[PDB]
């Protein structure tokens, strides 16, 4: 092609709004105020290539996985409509998080205005992934106890809506605030420790770990805390500057942790449903 030709540029000659991680020293797409060129760049090697494809394939996969869930026989469920509305809110959340992500990562270099608009959709999308992952979880964990399930849905909604408001703050999207971000999204996730404690208090140390939720919750909190640490600490590009430009840098790794994280979380709540089916909807 002879339309929208461009070359990868080193870090130093990026405009301030594109200067994100100073450990990725080269392979940067230059400012191109063409969506035509931005979306064509999905088929090009550059810093953002991996970030785009991880959350682009992860998005098609959750759209694929969520559709197959809707069309599951109603005999599989205890209350198929209710059960599907809860998983649907998880799938919608997961899909929106990744769609906002890969779209933002693709159109990132377009203009300061666009970068600003789409980053606000990026950050917000993370909160949506967290809010939606709580819905089927509280539903099964608080099946026979309805007052706490309602409370904890409101708690996650309030914290989630606060996080979404904080994502709109222009100073939040600066590299100096990169840690504040990892704390805001890590706290949002780790806040599940509140209803985890409340559940162990009521059901017991036998009931909680027998029904695999303790081992599963731990793995997920490992994924959550290790995942934020990578992003905030810019590892491994902090240790090999110029070598992690196109592959396995921290954002690219964190992207894999979000797809894996959402896949582990789905596998966990999909077990709480398989089990609630065997026992039935009683008390
Ligand atoms: C959630 C799904 C989202 C899918 C979005 C579409 C993906 C496929 C790619 C589309 C890119 C098409 C190019 C779109 C190009 C529009 C911008 C442009 O250069 O306009 C020129 C003039 O109007 C102004 O100078
Ligand atoms: C859309 C038609 C649905 C028909 C089947 C409905 C019957 C119940 C289905 C249960 C789940 C079956 C397996 C569902 C498999 C989900 C993952 C998926 O679709 O991945 C696609 C990827 O390869 C693309 O990246
Ligand atoms: C292992 C547990 C992880 C922690 C979970 C709880 C985290 C909750 C945190 C919420 C927000 C923390 C905000 C802390 C903000 C303090 C840093 C600051 O002011 O930096 C600004 C400058 O860098 C600008 O140049
Ligand atoms: C798809 C992931 C979630 C995103 C939101 C989608 C909202 C749903 C919108 C339209 C779909 C309406 C009809 C969805 C059809 C679901 C019921 C069904 O087919 O069950 C299979 C049974 O016949 C077996 O017993
Ligand atoms: C954010 C999206 C929330 C989820 C939207 C999709 C909800 C599930 C879709 C349809 C309701 C299915 C359960 C309805 C079950 C009705 C009883 C039955 O046996 O009906 C025959 C079935 O073939 C009818 O499906
Ligand atoms: C299951 C369905 C999955 C849906 C994924 C949706 C992905 C696309 C998301 C966002 C595209 C929005 C682009 C919007 C760009 C519009 C330009 C404009 O004038 O902006 C002013 C306002 O828009 C500012 O708020
Ligand atoms: C342009 C700068 C501002 C950034 C964009 C604005 C913030 C984007 C936020 C969210 C986008 C997706 C919203 C997704 C909302 C899903 C619907 C929902 O929550 O329904 C609740 C009911 O099912 C039960 O009550
Ligand atoms: C982008 C998604 C963001 C997250 C959205 C969170 C808000 C969803 C609102 C309301 C919950 C909808 C599902 C409602 C599920 C509970 C209905 C019920 O009667 O439960 C009884 C059970 O506890 C025992 O059988
Ligand atoms: C459990 C966590 C759930 C997330 C919801 C809460 C998110 C909001 C919390 C904290 C973000 C704000 C912290 C931002 C830290 C700096 C605030 C400040 O005063 O800056 C100006 C100074 O630099 C000079 O005067
Ligand atoms: C994406 C949402 C995933 C679900 C919510 C996760 C929120 C993070 C909070 C907590 C997860 C880690 C819980 C770790 C386990 C806490 C309960 C406990 O003290 O168990 C004692 C037993 O181990 C004795 O055998
Ligand atoms: C269920 C999913 C869990 C998977 C791991 C999540 C890691 C912890 C969450 C947040 C910390 C980092 C968030 C950084 C903000 C911007 C993110 C971005 O643009 O990719
Ligand atoms: Zn990202």
**8 in helix, strand or coil?**
coil
Query: CB burial class (10 A; 0-12, 13-18, 19+) of residue 5?
Result: exposed
Per the CB < 8 A criterion, the answer to whether 73 and 109 are in contact is: no
Count how many Cα atoms sit within 13 Å of the Cα of residue 125 in the half-sphere of its side chain.
Answer: 24
Ligand 9 pocket test, pick from 130, 161, 171, 184 with the greatest ligand atom count within 8 Å of Cβ, gives 184
Ligand 9 pocket test, pick from 123, 127, 171, 180 with the greatest ligand atom count within 8 Å of Cβ, gives 180
Tell me if 11 is assigned to a ligand binding site.
Answer: no
Per the CB < 8 A criterion, the answer to whether 129 and 93 are in contact is: yes
Q: Is 114 in the pocket of ligand 4 (CB under 6 A)?
A: no
Q: How many CB atoms lie within 10 A of CB 60?
A: 13
Q: Is 183 in the pocket of ligand 9 (CB under 6 A)?
A: no
- Ion ligand 12 neighbours, Cβ < 5 Å: 101
Q: Closest Cα partner for 10 from 34, 37, 30, 39? A: 30
| Distance of CA 180 from the midpoint of ligand 3 (Å) | 4
The span from the CA of 97 to the CA of 55, in Å, is: 9
Which H or E run contains 241?
A: none
Structure-determination approach: X-ray
**184 in helix, strand or coil?**
helix
Look at the chain and report how many structural domains it folds into. Answer: 1
Q: Is 146 in the pocket of ligand 8 (CB under 6 A)?
A: yes
The span from the CA of 105 to the CA of 199, in Å, is: 39
The span from the CA of 22 to the CA of 176, in Å, is: 12
Tell me if 251 is assigned to a ligand binding site.
Answer: yes
Contacts 24+ apart (CB under 8 A), 170-177: 170/116, 172/123, 173/116, 173/119, 173/120, 173/123, 175/19, 175/20, 175/21, 175/22
Q: Does residue 280 come out as left (phi exceeding 0), alpha (psi in the -120 to 50 range) or beta? A: left
Task: Spell out a b/e string for 12-43, using b for 16 or more CB atoms within 10 Å of the CB, else e.
Answer: eebeebbebbebbbebbbebbebeebbebbee
| Distance of CA 264 from the midpoint of ligand 10 (Å) | 14
Range of the domain at 62: 1-283
Q: Is 111 in the pocket of ligand 1 (CB under 6 A)?
A: no
Tell me if 255 is assigned to a ligand binding site.
Answer: yes
């Amino acid at each position: 092609e002879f339309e929208g030709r461009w070359r990868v540029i080193p870090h130093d000659v990026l405009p301030d709004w594109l200067k994100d991680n100073d450990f990725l020293l080269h392979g940067h797409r230059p400012p191109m105020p063409s969506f035509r060129a931005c979306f064509k760049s999905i088929f090009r090697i550059h810093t953002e290539t991996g970030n785009i494809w991880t959350h682009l394939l992860g998005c098609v996969f959750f759209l694929c996985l969520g559709i197959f869930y809707m069309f599951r026989p109603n005999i599989s469920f205890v209350a198929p409509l209710q059960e599907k509305v809860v998983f649907g809110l998880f799938f919608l959340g997961a899909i929106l998080c990744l769609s906002f992500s890969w779209l933002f990562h693709t159109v990132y270099c377009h203009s300061e205005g666009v970068s600003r608009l789409f980053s606000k959709l990026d950050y917000s999308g993370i909160a949506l992934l967290i809010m939606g992952s709580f819905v089927p979880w509280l539903y099964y964990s608080f099946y026979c106890n309805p007052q706490p399930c309602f409370i904890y849905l409101i708690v996650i909604c309030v914290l989630g809506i606060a996080a979404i408001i904080v994502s709109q703050w222009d100073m939040f999207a600066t590299p100096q605030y990169r840690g504040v971000r990892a704390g805001v999204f890590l706290g949002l996730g780790l806040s599940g420790i509140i209803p985890t404690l409340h559940y162990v208090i009521s059901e017991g140390f036998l009931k909680a770990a027998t029904i695999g939720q303790i081992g599963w919750l731990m793995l997920m909190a490992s994924l959550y805390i290790t995942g934020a640490a990578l992003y905030a600490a810019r590892i491994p590009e902090r240790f090999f500057p110029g070598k992690c430009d196109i592959w396995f840098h921290s954002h690219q790794l964190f992207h894999i942790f979000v797809v894996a994280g959402a896949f582990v979380h789905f596998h966990g709540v999909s077990n709480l449903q398989e089990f609630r089916f065997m026992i039935g909807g009683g008390c």
